[PDB]
Structure 1
Amino acid sequence: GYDLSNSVFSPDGRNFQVEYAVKAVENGTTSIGIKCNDGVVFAVEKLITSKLLVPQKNVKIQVVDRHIGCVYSGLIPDGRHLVNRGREEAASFKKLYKTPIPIPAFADRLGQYVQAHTLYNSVRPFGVSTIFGGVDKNGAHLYMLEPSGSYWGYKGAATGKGRQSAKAELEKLVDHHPEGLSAREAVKQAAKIIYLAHEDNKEKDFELEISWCSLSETNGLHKFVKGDLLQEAIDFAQKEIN
């Protein structure tokens, strides 16, 4: 019984519910966040379930404000509620203080919302991990938010099934470039480790979506990488894994 809910406590410091929420996020697809010098670059592995689908017509990276990219894994519907909530909170701050929200401020807000869902009998703690960042005027920042309401700064973060492949390769990238790398050069890097993170997920086929927010390419807005730039990334990675 004391292993069933969130308002319970147990004399092991465990609160079994919340730990079970990580297990939800562990069924998700790989999502990485590459922190570069100029901004942030997200990419998500998007499973192609069937050849019946209409392709490139589902976005798992949703914008909050005009400058904070948000991409999440775990329960897809559950995550859509958390993003809607952070779009309310962004909009409240934009009115009350007439500037686009800082990212350490966006962090406070979301952080509070999921923490809330471990203190009542009548709620369930959300089982999603978010990865969100952008450019504000104090510079680019990146945050990963655990379903437990835990978060930290990050020069590279990931979550998903293929968080195993992805993490080791991010170590490789801070030891390649310990003085950082360009946001343009990092499009090709997000392609490379999303492809490698589909060797823990090779029972299907997938589509790669890449988006960026960097100061120096997009004027500090959260945009998608699209057209011919996007296929250069696909080819690059495709040839390394062959």
Structure 2
Amino acid sequence: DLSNSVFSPDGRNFQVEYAVKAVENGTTSIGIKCNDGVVFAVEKLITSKLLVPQKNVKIQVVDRHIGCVYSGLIPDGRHLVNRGREEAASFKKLYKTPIPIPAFADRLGQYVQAHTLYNSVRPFGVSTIFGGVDKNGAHLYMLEPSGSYWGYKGAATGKGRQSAKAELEKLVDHHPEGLSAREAVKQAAKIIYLAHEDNKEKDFELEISWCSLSETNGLHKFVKGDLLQEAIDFAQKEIN
């Protein structure tokens, strides 16, 4: 059970479970596929008053059209992003057309894949949420340590995933036609607050980004500023 490559008496790779176990342990991240484009949000945890706000960004863009966030082991996340960054930019130079989100995941899945094959390497310790647009719409997926990922209507990992899960559940049915680009944000703003109630004694800072041909204009922009505020307040009222 102690090495990364090996299998258990009935086909099981334990190192990957623990990988998963560490992914949960970290902060909580989410994402939502709406009308056209997507919306992400994470949970920066203010551990002291000596932290400059609006600063240590956990969300990162890829190319100029892909949002991206995760949780678990922070440096692991960062690392993975780089590879994704090359692959993208290489492809782009090659085919000219900005990279299809559908395949992108694989490129990454395939890379996270490998780190489950050899014993000399350590499994990727992060679950990753992301999405973007293209010609045939916006997409959103979520990659785990096992390397297995898929397309979701909205995703979640880290500490309290259920909170946001059952929360994401509702939205589906009342808005079975994709939630408004705008409302998407402010709604995400809330779904976070609700899920934070574990680090409750410890204050925090919410970060949000999104994509949309109508709002962002095909791009990925950081939800900061005015829309950002009201989106909070919006959450702050339902916060009762």
Residues of 2 paired with 1:60 and 1:150: CA distance? 22
Residues of 1 paired with 2:214 and 2:207: CA distance? 20
TM-score normalised according to structure 2 size: 0.98
**Offset of 1:104 from its aligned partner?**
0.8
**Offset of 1:57 from its aligned partner?**
0.9
Unaligned runs of 5+ in 1: none
Unaligned runs of 5+ in 2: none
- Secondary structure at the aligned position of 1:53 is classed as coil
- Secondary structure at the aligned position of 2:155 is classed as strand
Q: 2:14 aligns with which of 10, 13, 16?
A: 16
CA displacement 1:179-215 (0-9 Å, x = unmatched): 1111111111101110001113213111111100111
**Offset of 1:132 from its aligned partner?**
1.1
Residues of 2 paired with 1:158 and 1:30: CA distance? 7
TM-score normalised according to structure 1 size: 0.97
**Offset of 1:176 from its aligned partner?**
1.6
- Secondary structure at the aligned position of 1:73 is classed as strand
Residues of 2 paired with 1:198 and 1:119: CA distance? 35
Residues of 2 paired with 1:140 and 1:207: CA distance? 27
**Offset of 1:172 from its aligned partner?**
0.8
**Offset of 1:168 from its aligned partner?**
0.6
- Secondary structure at the aligned position of 2:51 is classed as coil
Residues of 1 paired with 2:197 and 2:174: CA distance? 23
RMSD: 0.9
**Offset of 1:236 from its aligned partner?**
0.9
Percent of aligned pairs with the same amino acid:
100
CA displacement 1:95-145 (0-9 Å, x = unmatched): 111110000121110010011011112101111011110111121011100
Residues of 2 paired with 1:70 and 1:113: CA distance? 17
